CSV table of N, CA, C and O in Angstrom, one decimal:
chain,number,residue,atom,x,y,z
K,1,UNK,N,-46.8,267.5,-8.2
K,1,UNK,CA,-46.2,267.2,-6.9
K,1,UNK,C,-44.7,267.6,-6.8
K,1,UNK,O,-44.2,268.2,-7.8
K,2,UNK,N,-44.1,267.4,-5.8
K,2,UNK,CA,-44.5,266.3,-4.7
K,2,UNK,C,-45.3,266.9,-3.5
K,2,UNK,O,-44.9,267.7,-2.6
K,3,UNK,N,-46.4,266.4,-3.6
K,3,UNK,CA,-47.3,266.8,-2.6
K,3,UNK,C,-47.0,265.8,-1.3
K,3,UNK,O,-47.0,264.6,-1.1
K,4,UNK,N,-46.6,267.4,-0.1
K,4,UNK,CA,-45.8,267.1,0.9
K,4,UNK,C,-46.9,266.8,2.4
K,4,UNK,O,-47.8,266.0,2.3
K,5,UNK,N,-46.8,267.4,3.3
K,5,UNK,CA,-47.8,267.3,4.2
K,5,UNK,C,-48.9,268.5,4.1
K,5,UNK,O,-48.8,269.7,3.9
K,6,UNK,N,-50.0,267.4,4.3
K,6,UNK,CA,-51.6,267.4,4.1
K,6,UNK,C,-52.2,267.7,5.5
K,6,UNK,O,-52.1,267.0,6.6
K,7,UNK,N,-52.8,268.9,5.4
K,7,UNK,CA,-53.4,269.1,7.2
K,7,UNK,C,-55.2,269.2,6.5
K,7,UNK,O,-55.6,269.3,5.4
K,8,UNK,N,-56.0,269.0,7.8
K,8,UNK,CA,-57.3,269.4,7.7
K,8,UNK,C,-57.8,270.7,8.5
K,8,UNK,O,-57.5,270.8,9.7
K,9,UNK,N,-58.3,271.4,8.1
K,9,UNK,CA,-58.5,272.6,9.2
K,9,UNK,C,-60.0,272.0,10.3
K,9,UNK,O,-61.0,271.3,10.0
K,10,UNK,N,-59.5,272.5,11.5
K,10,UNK,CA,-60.3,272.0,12.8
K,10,UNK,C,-61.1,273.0,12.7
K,10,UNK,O,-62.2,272.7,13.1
K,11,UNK,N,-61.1,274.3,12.2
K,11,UNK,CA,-62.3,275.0,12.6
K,11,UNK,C,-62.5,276.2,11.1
K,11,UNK,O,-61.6,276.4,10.3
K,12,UNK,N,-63.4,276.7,11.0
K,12,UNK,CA,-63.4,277.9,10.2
K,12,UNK,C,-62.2,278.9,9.9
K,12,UNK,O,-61.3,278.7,10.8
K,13,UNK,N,-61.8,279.5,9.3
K,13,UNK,CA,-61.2,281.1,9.8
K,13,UNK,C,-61.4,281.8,8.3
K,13,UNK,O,-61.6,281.4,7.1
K,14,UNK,N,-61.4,282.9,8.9
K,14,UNK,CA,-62.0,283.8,8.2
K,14,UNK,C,-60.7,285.1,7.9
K,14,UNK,O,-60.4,285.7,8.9
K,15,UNK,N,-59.9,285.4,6.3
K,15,UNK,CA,-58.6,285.8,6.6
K,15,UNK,C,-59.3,287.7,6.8
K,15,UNK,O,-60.2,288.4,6.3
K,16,UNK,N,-58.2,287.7,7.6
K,16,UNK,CA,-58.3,289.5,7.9
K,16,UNK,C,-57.4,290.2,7.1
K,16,UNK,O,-57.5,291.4,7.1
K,17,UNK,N,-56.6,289.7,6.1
K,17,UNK,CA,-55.8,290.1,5.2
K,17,UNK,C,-55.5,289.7,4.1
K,17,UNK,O,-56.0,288.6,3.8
K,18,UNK,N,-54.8,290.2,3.2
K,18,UNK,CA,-54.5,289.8,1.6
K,18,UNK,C,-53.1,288.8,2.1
K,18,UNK,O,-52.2,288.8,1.3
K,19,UNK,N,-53.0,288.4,2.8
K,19,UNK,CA,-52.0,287.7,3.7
K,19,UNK,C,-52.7,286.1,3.8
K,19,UNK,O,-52.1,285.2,3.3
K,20,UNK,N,-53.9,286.0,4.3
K,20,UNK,CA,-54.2,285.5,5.1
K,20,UNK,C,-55.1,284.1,3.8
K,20,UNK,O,-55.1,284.4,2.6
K,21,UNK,N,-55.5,283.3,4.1
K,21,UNK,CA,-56.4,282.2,3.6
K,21,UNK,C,-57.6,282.6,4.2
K,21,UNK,O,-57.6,283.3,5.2
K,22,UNK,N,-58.8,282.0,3.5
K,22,UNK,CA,-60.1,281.7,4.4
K,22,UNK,C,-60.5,280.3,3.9
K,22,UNK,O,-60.6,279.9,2.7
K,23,UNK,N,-60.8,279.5,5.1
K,23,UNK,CA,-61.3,278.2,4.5
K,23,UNK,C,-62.3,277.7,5.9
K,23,UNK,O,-62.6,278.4,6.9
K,24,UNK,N,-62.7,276.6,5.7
K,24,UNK,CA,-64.2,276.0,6.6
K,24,UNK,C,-63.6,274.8,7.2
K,24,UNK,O,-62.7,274.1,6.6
K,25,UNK,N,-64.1,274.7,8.4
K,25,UNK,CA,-63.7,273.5,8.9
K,25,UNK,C,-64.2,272.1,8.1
K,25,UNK,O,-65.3,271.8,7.6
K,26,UNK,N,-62.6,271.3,8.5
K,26,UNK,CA,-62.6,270.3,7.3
K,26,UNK,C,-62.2,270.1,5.9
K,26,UNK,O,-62.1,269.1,5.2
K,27,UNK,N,-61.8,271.3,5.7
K,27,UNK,CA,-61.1,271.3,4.5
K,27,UNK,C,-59.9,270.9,4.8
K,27,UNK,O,-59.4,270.9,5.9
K,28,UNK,N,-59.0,270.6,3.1
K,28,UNK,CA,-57.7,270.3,3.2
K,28,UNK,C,-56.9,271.2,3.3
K,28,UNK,O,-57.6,272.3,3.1
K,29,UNK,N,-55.3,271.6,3.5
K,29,UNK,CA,-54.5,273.0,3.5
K,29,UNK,C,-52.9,271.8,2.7
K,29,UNK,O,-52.1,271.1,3.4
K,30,UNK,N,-53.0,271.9,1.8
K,30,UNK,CA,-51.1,271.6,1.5
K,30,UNK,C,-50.2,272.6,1.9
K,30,UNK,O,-50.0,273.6,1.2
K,31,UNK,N,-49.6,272.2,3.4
K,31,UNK,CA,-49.0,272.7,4.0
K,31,UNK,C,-47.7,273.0,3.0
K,31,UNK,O,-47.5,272.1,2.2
K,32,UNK,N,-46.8,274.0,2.9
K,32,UNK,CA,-46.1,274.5,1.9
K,32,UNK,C,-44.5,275.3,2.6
K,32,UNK,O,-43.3,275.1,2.1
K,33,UNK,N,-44.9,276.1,3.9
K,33,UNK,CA,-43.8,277.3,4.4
K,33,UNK,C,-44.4,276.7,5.8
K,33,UNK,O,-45.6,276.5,5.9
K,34,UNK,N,-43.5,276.3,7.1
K,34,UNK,CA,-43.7,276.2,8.5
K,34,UNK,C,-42.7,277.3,8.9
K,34,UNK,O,-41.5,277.1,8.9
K,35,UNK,N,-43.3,278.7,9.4
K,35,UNK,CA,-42.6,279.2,10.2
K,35,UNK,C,-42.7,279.5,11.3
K,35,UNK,O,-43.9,279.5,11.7
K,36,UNK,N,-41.7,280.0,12.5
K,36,UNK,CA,-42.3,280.2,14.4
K,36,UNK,C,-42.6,281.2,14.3
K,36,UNK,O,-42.0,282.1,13.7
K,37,UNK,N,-43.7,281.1,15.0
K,37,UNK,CA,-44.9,282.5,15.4
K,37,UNK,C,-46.0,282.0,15.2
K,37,UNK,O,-46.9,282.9,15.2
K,38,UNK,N,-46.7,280.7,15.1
K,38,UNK,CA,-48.0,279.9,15.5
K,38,UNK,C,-48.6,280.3,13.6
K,38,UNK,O,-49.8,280.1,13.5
K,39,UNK,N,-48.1,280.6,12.7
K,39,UNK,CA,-49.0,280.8,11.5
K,39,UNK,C,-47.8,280.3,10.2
K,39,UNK,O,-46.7,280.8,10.0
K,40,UNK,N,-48.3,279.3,9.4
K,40,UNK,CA,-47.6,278.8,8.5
K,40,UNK,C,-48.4,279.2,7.0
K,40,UNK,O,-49.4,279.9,6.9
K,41,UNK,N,-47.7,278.7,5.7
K,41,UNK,CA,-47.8,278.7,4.3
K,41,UNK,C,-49.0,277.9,3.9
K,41,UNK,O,-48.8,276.8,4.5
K,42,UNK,N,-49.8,277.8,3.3
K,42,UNK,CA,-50.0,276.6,2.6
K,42,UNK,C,-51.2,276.9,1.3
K,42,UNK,O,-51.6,278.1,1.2
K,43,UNK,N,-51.7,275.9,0.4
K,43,UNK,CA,-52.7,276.1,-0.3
K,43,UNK,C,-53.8,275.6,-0.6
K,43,UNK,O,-53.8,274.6,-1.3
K,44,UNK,N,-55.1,276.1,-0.1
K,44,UNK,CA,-55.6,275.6,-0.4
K,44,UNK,C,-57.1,276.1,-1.2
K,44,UNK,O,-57.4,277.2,-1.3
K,45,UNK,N,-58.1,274.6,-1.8
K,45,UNK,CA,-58.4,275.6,-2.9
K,45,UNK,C,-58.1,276.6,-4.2
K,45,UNK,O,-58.5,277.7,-4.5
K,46,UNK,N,-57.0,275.8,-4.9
K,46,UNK,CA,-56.2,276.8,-5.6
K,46,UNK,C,-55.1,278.1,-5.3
K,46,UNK,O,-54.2,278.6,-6.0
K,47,UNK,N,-55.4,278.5,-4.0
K,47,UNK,CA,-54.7,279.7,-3.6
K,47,UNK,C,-54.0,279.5,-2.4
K,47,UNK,O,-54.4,278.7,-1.5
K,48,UNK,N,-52.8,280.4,-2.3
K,48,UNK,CA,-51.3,280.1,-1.2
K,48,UNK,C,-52.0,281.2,-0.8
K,48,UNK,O,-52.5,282.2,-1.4
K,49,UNK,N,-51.8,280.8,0.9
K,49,UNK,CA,-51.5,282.1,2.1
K,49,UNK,C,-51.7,281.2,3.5
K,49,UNK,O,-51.9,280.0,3.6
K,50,UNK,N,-51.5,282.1,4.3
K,50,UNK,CA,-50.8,282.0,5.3
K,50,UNK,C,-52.2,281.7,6.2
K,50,UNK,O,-53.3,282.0,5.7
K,51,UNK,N,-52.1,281.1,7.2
K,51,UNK,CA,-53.5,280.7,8.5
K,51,UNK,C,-52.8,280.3,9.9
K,51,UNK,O,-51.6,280.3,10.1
K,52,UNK,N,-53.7,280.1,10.7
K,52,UNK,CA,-53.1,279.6,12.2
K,52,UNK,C,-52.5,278.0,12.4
K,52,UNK,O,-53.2,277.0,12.4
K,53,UNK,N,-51.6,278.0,12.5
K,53,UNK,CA,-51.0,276.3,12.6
K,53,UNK,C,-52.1,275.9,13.8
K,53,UNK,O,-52.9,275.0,13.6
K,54,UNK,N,-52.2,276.4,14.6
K,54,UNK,CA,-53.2,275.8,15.6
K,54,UNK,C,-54.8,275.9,15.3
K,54,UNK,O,-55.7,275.9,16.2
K,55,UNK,N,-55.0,276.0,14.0
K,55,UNK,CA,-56.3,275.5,13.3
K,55,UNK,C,-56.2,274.5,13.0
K,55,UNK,O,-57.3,273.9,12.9
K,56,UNK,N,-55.1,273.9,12.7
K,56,UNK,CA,-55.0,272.4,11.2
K,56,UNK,C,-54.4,271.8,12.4
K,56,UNK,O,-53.7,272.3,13.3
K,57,UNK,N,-55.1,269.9,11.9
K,57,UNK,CA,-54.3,268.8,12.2
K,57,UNK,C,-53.6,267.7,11.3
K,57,UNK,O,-54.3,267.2,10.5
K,58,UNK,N,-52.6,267.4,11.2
K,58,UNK,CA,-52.2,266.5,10.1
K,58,UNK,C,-53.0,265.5,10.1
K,58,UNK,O,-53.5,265.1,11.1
K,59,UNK,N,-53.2,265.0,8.9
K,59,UNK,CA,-53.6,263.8,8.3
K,59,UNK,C,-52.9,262.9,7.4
K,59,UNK,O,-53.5,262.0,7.0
């Protein structure tokens, strides 16, 4: 830790890059880097990268 804020993803996504995460709706994301432009940091599953903030809802 310190394990900071905890999001759940609302839907699928599928990453288009070595950039990007892929995870299923319902999973967890440890939210990590918040930057503007709608796409933040986080990890989940063992591995850091980036997804759509307007996929995930906090929990």
């Amino acid at each position: 830790g310190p394990l900071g804020s905890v999001v759940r993803a609302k839907f699928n996504f599928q990453q288009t890059n070595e950039d990007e995460l892929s995870f299923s709706k319902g999973d967890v994301i440890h939210v990590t880097r918040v930057e503007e432009g709608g796409w933040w940091e986080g990890t989940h599953n063992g591995r850091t990268g980036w997804f759509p903030s307007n996929y995930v809802r906090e929990i």
